[PDB]
Amino acid sequence: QEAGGRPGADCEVCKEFLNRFYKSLIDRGVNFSLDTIEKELISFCLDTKGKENRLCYYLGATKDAATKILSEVTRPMSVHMPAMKICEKLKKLDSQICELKYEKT
Helix, strand or coil: CCCCCCCCCCCCHHHHHHHHHHHHHHHHCCCCCHHHHHHHHHHHHHCCCHHHHHHHHHHCCCCCCCHHHHHHHHHHHCCCCCHHHHHHHHCCCCCCCCCCCCCCC
């Protein structure tokens, strides 16, 4: 998972999720299928810690929460894309996505 330097996207939890999810699907060979990216969003979103399990409510997934924005993740996740800046695009959809910091402590 991950990448050296954590170049996920923008804020933090949003970036780590996108980046790790993104290169995971590409590496696992579990991509190029929008419906699959949707199902794996479900899988990955719930199979993580509260920060990410909660973060996904802002991004979609879980077959609930926000169903429209879900497609705006899966589609660019299907091809090597801006996904870092996509969290910046996400900022235009909601600003709260930029937070949820793992450990401010």
